[model samples]
Target chain A: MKNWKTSAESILTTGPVVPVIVVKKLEHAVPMAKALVAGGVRVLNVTLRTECAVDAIRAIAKEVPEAIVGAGTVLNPQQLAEVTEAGAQFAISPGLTEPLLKAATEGTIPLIPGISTVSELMLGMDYGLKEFKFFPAEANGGVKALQAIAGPFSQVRFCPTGGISPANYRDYLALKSVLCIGGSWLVPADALEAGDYDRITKLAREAVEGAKL
Target chain B: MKNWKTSAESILTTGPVVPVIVVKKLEHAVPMAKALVAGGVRVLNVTLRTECAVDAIRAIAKEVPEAIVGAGTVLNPQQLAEVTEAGAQFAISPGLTEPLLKAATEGTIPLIPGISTVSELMLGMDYGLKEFKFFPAEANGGVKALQAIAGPFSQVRFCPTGGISPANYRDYLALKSVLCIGGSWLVPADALEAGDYDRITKLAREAVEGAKL
Candidate 1:
């Protein structure tokens, strides 16, 4: 938590949207990152759901310096370490564990672990983290649920992810607890596979434009 | 987790509805436990939200042999130890923490910690727990939310608590992952304050009868 190169808050608050990227092919990582960056969305969350995820993170970090690159689906201490070494600026998870929290507290990058309950948030707060991911946001009761969970902890901030779309992402952004949101819509699978970076850029541009309050 | 007197599954499946009891006065603990037992609901969760909670557990453990009593809202190691020493057969938390899990794994009784996400449930599973409380159940997306969270973990069982009532308790009970549901409706605060033990018994009986599949 201390002496981190940058805070998770700074990374998340950099833009209104962080594209939850899943790189199936290594070659698309940098250009896709660049396209999102060109569209005014620079905070990229490259999820570790594929074999080339670590490499994708590395590629984006080394090539697309304009993007604030981070790793997602980081479930444990080992993955946290791996992502940090891969040049991830910050780390995010679908949920948190103590070992993960403990390692992240002592590690160099900020970890915005996910939480769906007060106790989960309290556990993260104990480790000195104020930023978090309210994961599966729509499935976890959307704005109303987030409001009830955030009712007690005013200082805490969130980036709601999963089941979030352009239609309702603004509703989450309107909440005091939400700093930003993570969405996969900005990078369509076909857009990535067909090397249609322009479409991805357009999606990202529309998201950023629509996010304006 | 090792050499435990009973498993969390046994504790949860003993009855259909575990009364989420809140003892405001010390004297009401024993009779309240007995009242639930008389109504065919034997598993009781005495939440440690009050100063007299530990004593209440002690009173119930000593007097109500027919009821399987446990502690709820047990957040940390100290609380877990206190409840165990006070003769609680098991412990339930609103959420899980590593420190608490580690302590419970090393403690005598089983700890059925609450979880609101698959990752939280996975973390508890890492510590060897099979049963969990899907806490703040209603606010955390109700039956559908629990269904999504439970979809991947077929082996796990749950007791969905928070915002539960007689009207919708059956819906949760209908789920395959759910063994039972924890409800505060069985112990009305006014009923206890007015020493209306019969009302508590009647509510408990109704819940037990209504839980029949």
Candidate 2:
């Protein structure tokens, strides 16, 4: 039913780590994308937690040729439409919603919506979605919880987000069900505020390097 | 939109603790429920986890006049329908789904479906549900996670199930958002197999008495 779901799988497969980017300023978007791309991270999830996030996604999509820009915190169908209009290559939500999933299945870009339990995972699966985000990762039981939740679904894959850090991302990556992980640590807000693009690049490179182990 | 939801609220509010019962043998359902009532417990959740669970609920409802019998692990509309037909006064799911929510809202009984994320809570709220089951509670980050998930929805209440035991059930009952908790500890399989209804009553009394503190 979802022919484009392959694109969703590819987006996660292209990642060992996807930065859960929250761009406070539109201007920081392009440079941040470039910095991360330079350091070998490209699957960027610009969350709509900020006012200018859509514009930021628009800027990154337009100017940053190397980055595979996406949107995070895309909660509903309206936001999904807005992000797709803004040229988001992919979209992610903190949890799955029927309206959101319905819109995404029919929309152009892939929606790798988040799920916190097996029932949510099963609902998404009913819609033919094999990929999901295990959101609030640490707050929702971390690595062990993910294993228990994913135990029954051998074909399903996850990109666990929230409360993930360099210290714990590898733990999730180590799981067979986890394709990638979403972490806010890679693009620190302080680093962006300080215009420390180099630090962002360094963090990205370190994360990419750390995942190897 | 949900005038019947008050009944939902009353169900959880009437509890300091609820038993997440899995009735393997149908004959035990009535006596076990009566024993719980004898020990100051009225609400019971006979889960659909077992093959004879529906008959158990039927037996409990018909034979045990004092017990406010219900169903747990109710995953979908069909199960919801079956339980409602079998005389379940209320229903609880391990997680929430849109179709289930849609069906429950239109049906007579209350659906205290489970949730582990903000977005899931938001979807259930949209359906006018004010109560939830925080399933796999201890495994899903326990009291701290429940606090975080419940923080935003001030009006929402919960009956946390999963990984809850005598040792730590009170930790959840202490939370303002938690109206009660569901525990399998009250009806250990061995106690039922041994036909030790007295032990079930003792456990129920202990749970009720312990919640007073």
Candidate 3:
């Protein structure tokens, strides 16, 4: 945490809604990040789902100084190291494992790994991480289930991802345990493919405005 | 594996429904196990949610030969060791950890650890565990979610637990990834409290018979 450019808490706290970005073309990375930043979103979680992901992070980190760039879907230590050097300020994973947890704690960047159960939460907490991503949120029994899971751990905070949207994001933001939420609705694939940066900005703004409720 | 009295496979396969037993009164353990066995459910999962759980496992292991007695809610290596020494045939945990996974692989009993995501499943698989308990099954997005999670892994199997019952037990059994289910419906706390062993026998019979569909 000391070596991290910023704490995981600050990143999530900055976002009542952080865009889960998927950059298909390397050229689009800078503009995409700039658009989101212009629309009041600063934490860009560029997922490493494609071949160009690491390059995108590198490009965005160099080009978009206003946006706090990070990596998502970071599964292992190797990926964590790759993204850390690529200039990611933080990392988010869909789940946690010992090898990954150990690596993140010892590494420079803050890894906000995903957890679906109390045991998974405890495992992450064991590694000195108090922040987490409650993944597949709606499928994992939505708000009530998260409430049940978060009830015991008073200090733990979460950023519920997967199936989070404008219609229901306020509900997640409403939770005291939740610092922020990761949503894909901000950058629709078709919008990116079509190079509709304006639409991306609009979506980001709407999401931010909606969270104000 | 050689040290294990039985494989995790055999225990799960033995159950069209394995009762997720929670015994309050230590005296009820043996008779309760006997009732379930009488109704054709032989794999008894005695959860360590009570003070007498270990004693109950010991009592049932000593007293009931027909039953394959195991411990549930086993969180760590110490509990695993304690249950193994108490004569538990197998162990079930709500989730897996490196220490627990390592201990099970090196110890004398099969550990059918619970997993809710692909990464979690992969972590257990890394330790050579092929079977798992899809805990809080209904809460973790039910059959559709399990299917999506289990799709890539051809050989992996599961015994789905939590929020599973007679009305929907067959639905889970219908999935190829599912070997069996763990349900608390069979041994209701009220029945155990009232000493109505016959009711438990009836519940077991009905659950098993219902599984045939």
- Estimate the TM-score of every prediction: 0.62, 0.62, 0.62
In candidate 3 the C-alpha lDDT for residue B146 amounts to 79
Ten-residue segment with the worst summed lDDT in candidate 2 chain A? A1-10
Best by DockQ: 2
Worst ten-residue run, lDDT, model 1 chain A? Answer: A1-10
Q: How far is candidate 1 from the true structure (C-alpha RMSD, Å)?
A: 6.7
Q: Write the per-residue lDDT of candidate 3 for residues B112-158, one digit (tens) a residue.
A: 99887888899999998899999778776789987898999979999
DockQ of each: 0.18, 0.21, 0.17
- Tens digit of per-residue lDDT, candidate 2, span A104-165: 99988999988877877898998889899887777867898878988888889999887778
* List of chain B TM-scores, one per candidate: 0.98, 0.97, 0.98
Over the true interface, candidate 2 deviates by an RMSD, in Å, of 3.5
**C-alpha DockQ for predicted model 2:** 0.21
Q: Candidate 2 lDDT, tens digit per residue, B1-213?
A: 553633888888786889989778888888899999999888999999999999999988998888889999999999999999999999999998889999999998999999768777869976877899997897778888887566435578999999988899889989999899999999999999989999999999999999977
**Taking candidate 3, what TM-score does its chain B reach relative to the real chain B?**
0.98
